[PDB]
Amino acid sequence: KKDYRKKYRKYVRSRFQCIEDRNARLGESVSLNKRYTRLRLIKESPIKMELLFDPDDEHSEPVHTVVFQGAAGIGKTILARKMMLDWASGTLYQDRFDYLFYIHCREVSLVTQRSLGDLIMSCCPDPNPPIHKIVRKPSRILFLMDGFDELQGAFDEHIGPLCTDWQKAERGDILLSSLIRKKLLPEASLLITTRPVALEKLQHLLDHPRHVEILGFSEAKRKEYFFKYFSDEAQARAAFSLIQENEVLFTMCFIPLVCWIVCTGLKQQMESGKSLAQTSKTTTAVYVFFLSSLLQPLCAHLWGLCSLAADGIWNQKILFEESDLRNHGLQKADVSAFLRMNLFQKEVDCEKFYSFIHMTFQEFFAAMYYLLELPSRDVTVLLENYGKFEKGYLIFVVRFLFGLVNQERTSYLEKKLSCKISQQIRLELLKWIEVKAKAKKLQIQPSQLELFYCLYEMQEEDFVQRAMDYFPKIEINLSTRMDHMVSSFCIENCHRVESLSLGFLHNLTSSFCRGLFSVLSTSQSLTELDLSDNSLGDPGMRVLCETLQHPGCNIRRLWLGRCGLSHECCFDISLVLSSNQKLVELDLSDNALGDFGIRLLCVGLKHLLCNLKKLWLVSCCLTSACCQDLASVLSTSHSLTRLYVGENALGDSGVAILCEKAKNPQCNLQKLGLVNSGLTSVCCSALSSVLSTNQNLTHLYLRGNTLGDKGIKLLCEGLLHPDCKLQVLELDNCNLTSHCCWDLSTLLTSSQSLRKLSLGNNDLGDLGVMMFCEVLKQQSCLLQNLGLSEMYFNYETKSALETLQEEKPELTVVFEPS
Numbered sequence: 006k007k008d009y010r011k012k013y014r015k016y017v018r019s020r021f022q023c024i025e026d027r028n029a030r031l032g033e034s035v036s037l038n039k040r041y042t043r044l045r046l047i048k049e050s051p052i053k054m055e056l057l058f059d060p061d062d063e064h065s066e067p068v069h070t071v072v073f074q075g076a077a078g079i080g081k082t083i084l085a086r087k088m089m090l091d092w093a094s095g096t097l098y099q100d101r102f103d104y105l106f107y108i109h110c111r112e113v114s115l116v117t118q119r120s121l122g123d124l125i126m127s128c129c130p131d132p133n134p135p136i137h138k139i140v141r142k143p144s145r146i147l148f149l150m151d152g153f154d155e156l157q158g159a160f161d162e163h164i165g166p167l168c169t170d171w172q173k174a175e176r177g178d179i180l181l182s183s184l185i186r187k188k189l190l191p192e193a194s195l196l197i198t199t200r201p202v203a204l205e206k207l208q209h210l211l212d213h214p215r216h217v218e219i220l221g222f223s224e225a226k227r228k229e230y231f232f233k234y235f236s237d238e239a240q241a242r243a244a245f246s247l248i249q250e251n252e253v254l255f256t257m258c259f260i261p262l263v264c265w266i267v268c269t270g271l272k273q274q275m276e277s278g279k280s281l282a283q284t285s286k287t288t289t290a291v292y293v294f295f296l297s298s299l300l301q302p303l304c305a306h307l308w309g310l311c312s313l314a315a316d317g318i319w320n321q322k323i324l325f326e327e328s329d330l331r332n333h334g335l336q337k338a339d340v341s342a343f344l345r346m347n348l349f350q351k352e353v354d355c356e357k358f359y360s361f362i363h364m365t366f367q368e369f370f371a372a373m374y375y376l377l378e379l380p381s382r383d384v385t386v387l388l389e390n391y392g393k394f395e396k397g398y399l400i401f402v403v404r405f406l407f408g409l410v411n412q413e414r415t416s417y418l419e420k421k422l423s424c425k426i427s428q429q430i431r432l433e434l435l436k437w438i439e440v441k442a443k444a445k446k447l448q449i450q451p452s453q454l455e456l457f458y459c460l461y462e463m464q465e466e467d468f469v470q471r472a473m474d475y476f477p478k479i480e481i482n483l484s485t486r487m488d489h490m491v492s493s494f495c496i497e498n499c500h501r502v503e504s505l506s507l508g509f510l511h512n513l514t515s516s517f518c519r520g521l522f523s524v525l526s527t528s529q530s531l532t533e534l535d536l537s538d539n540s541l542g543d544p545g546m547r548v549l550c551e552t553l554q555h556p557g558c559n560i561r562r563l564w565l566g567r568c569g570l571s572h573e574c575c576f577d578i579s580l581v582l583s584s585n586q587k588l589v590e591l592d593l594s595d596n597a598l599g600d601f602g603i604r605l606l607c608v609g610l611k612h613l614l615c616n617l618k619k620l621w622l623v624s625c626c627l628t629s630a631c632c633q634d635l636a637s638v639l640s641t642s643h644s645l646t647r648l649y650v651g652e653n654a655l656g657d658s659g660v661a662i663l664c665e666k667a668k669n670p671q672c673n674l675q676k677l678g679l680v681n682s683g684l685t686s687v688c689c690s691a692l693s694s695v696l697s698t699n700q701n702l703t704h705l706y707l708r709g710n711t712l713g714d715k716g717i718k719l720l721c722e723g724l725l726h727p728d729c730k731l732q733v734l735e736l737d738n739c740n741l742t743s744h745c746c747w748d749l750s751t752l753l754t755s756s757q758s759l760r761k762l763s764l765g766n767n768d769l770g771d772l773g774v775m776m777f778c779e780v781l782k783q784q785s786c787l788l789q790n791l792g793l794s795e796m797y798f799n800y801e802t803k804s805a806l807e808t809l810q811e812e813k814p815e816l817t818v819v820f821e822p823s
């Protein structure tokens with residue numbers, strides 16, 4: 006008769022109309038989802054709200070699971086609620102899905118036992134829905150698991166009884182894992198929202214998820230929010246200008262939650278006829294300001310409220326029963342006031358539990374609890390439980406303590422904290438940083454950035470400049486604007502950093518990092534700067550090249566690996582080399598600095614006051630055409646001693662040019678990396694001439710060329726020369742055969758200066774090695790690796806090699822293949 010799908014869609018449209026879907030909205034007004042501001046979705050590459058489950062570019066495999074992630078306050082849940090409404094209205098996924106079932110993790114227990122009855126609880130008011138009909142058809146339904154990280158209590162991802170069969174009742178934790186791992190209702194779709202930190206215990210369940218990151222407001226969107234929030238444009242302009250003038254707060258308003266907190270504060274000031282003050286710079290300052298205005302007009306119950314929040318964190322409770330409020334002395338008075346001021350909610354949607362408007366407020370109050378004037382009241386215990394799911398990670402609780410524990414405090418809430426306690430905690434927090442900063446290990450504890458966020462909140466140079474002494478090496482990954490302002494602050498207030506690595510992510514090729522580079526240029530301790538493996542396109546390299554010319558720069562080693570630089574950037578690099586007398590080592594490997602780029606780069610290299618000693622030009626798409634300019638540099642540059650030009654097309658007609666100039670006995674070249682240039686035996690006579698005449702050359706790396714036995718013979722004529730000082734000769738797969746063993750054998754006993762001979766993956770022969778074993782015993786000068794790796798031998802040969810190792814300890818290691 007009548008369909009159910011129409012009734013369910015009607016229910017969803019009627020229910021999902023508000024942003025909060027809760028009371029206490031300053032007079033219990035309706036927020037209206039029409040107020041929703043679109044958030045950008047970036048695939049972990051912009052994507053739409055639809056097409057999330059579609060097959061991708063290759064293999065055409067469908068996507069069952071989509072995972073959305075983002076920071077607290079971004080609006081993961083609002084997006085999920087928007088999807089429910091757009092679907093019910095028939096504009097989103099109107100074809101492929103018959104039902105969307107919204108699961109609110111905050112309301113899901115991991116203690117109780119239940120069947121998959123949430124297909125009933127999430128349905129319209131009718132207590133007996135057709136669960137055994139169309140609702141039971143897999144692939145036509147999508148579950149929305151909103152707030153995975155909000156699940157209260159321990160969550161065990163490794164279980165036996167996965168519990169198939171939706172009609173079977175089992176533990177809430179088992180049931181959630183069963184849906185995520187697709188054991189229950191196979192082929193059903195699933196959308197999960199989570200904080201990035203909580204992925205630690207989710208990655209083991211997802212198997213093959215599609216990851217999407219949720220972004221905050223752009224400048225254009227931030228402005229609209231204020232104008233949509235403040236119905237009077239005259240007041241909207243005032244509010245916008247007050248915030249726009251504060252660069253730090255404007256940046257913070259990136260997160261929807263922050264701009265909301267600020268807007269409410271200003272709205273209250275407007276109504277009361279106040280000056281509309283707003284001077285907050287830190288996260289703590291914003292939250293304190295809000296509560297200061299909210300609770301001052303209450304504060305008499307601050308202790309009880311803080312104890313409630315503290316208990317909720319330690320005993321894993323978000324939803325409070327009236328009995329839990331009464332037990333803290335919070336009843337029939339301030340609770341109503343908290344609802345009126347939109348600090349606390351009643352969850353009036355057919356329920357009688359209370360909650361805080363946001364987890365950051367609950368954690369904020371828990372942070373104050375420890376400092377006021379009952380599970381612990383011990384900071385040590387709190388910090389020891391930081392890296393734990395079971396306590397909610399406590400990221401904001403600790404972060405807020407850093408902000409709250411200060412000396413520059415004023416009236417309203419901030420003055421109700423104990424001084425002696427603040428002093429005791431400040432010492433413990435500093436020790437906490439010292440240990441975590443030193444313990445630079447892979448873990449879920451602070452990862453060299455969260456510590457900066459903590460120090461940022463602690464706006465005190467006396468504390469920050471001291472805490473930063475434990476960060477001699479800074480390795481950070483920056484994806485947003487807040488990351489840059491926080492890292493800039495901490496790096497600037499640091500006098501003991503020796504090296505820095507900046508992993509720029511999907512925000513450079515712009516001015517975004519200009520402020521950070523400016524700070525680095527004034528450091529007197531930074532020696533090594535690593536900017537490899539990120540999109541430092543030419544525009545970014547220009548900014549850096551200008552930065553590196555500062556008189557106080559002091560950077561000696563600069564690594565610019567796979568940055569995707571082109572030949573145009575070599576103009577700016579040349580300018581730096583010609584004036585920067587500090588830079589010693591420069592790595593340009595894997596860029597696209599073709600022959601033209603070298604022609605320009607060589608201008609700086611040949612310039613007076615250029616002190617560069619080690620230059621890497623590996624895999625730079627070079628050909629023999631550039632050998633003339635590189636050769637000129639070797640001839641005239643007395644400072645360049647290490648040159649690596651392998652993995653290029655500098656064939657035999659090219660190496661000959663480098664050799665002709667390197668042959669000159671006044672050339673200071675010590676190490677030459679002609680690794681994979683495609684050299685052939687015809688050029689070995691050029692290498693021979695260099696080895697014979699150039700007494701400075703000590704290391705030659707030829708692995709990857711094709712020399713054969715003829716090449717070895719020619720090299721040996723040079724290597725056996727009395728003036729040859731080569732110490733290390735590397736000969737990996739050079740297409741060698743056993744016919745060259747007589748000449749290699751000669752080197753082993755005739756050479757006086759060779760120390761290492763790394764024969765690698767080639768058909769050297771077992772008989773060849775046996776020859777070496779016998780001659781190596783005759784007072785050989787070889788002390789280092791003899792190679793013979795990546796090849797296989799028979800039993801007797803391997804025994805001989807093992808014997809050689811024991812009979813003549815002077816040889817570091819033989820390196821048998823097995």
Ligand SMILES: Nc1ncnc2c1ncn2[C@@H]1O[C@H](COP(=O)(O)OP(=O)(O)OP(=O)(O)O)[C@@H](O)[C@H]1O
Nearest residue numbers: 040041042077078079080081082083152261262265
């Ligand atoms: N896209 C948006 N458009 C308009 N307002 C938004 C948007 N996103 C979030 N909000 C603002 O943020 C406030 C709360 O955001 P929200 O409840 O989604 O925090 P949350 O962390 O995502 O929730 P949860 O605790 O489940 O993770 C809302 O009251 C609203 O003012």
Ligand SMILES: CN1CCC[C@@H](Nc2nnc(-c3ccc(C(F)(F)F)cc3O)c3c2CCCC3)C1
Nearest residue numbers: 076077078260262263288365400454455485487
């Ligand atoms: C552990 N830590 C490792 C390094 C990266 C860091 N990421 C962020 N953390 N926190 C917030 C954040 C959200 C909300 C709030 C507010 F209190 F206002 F609600 C204040 C915040 O600092 C953010 C980000 C990145 C994106 C920007 C917002 C997490």
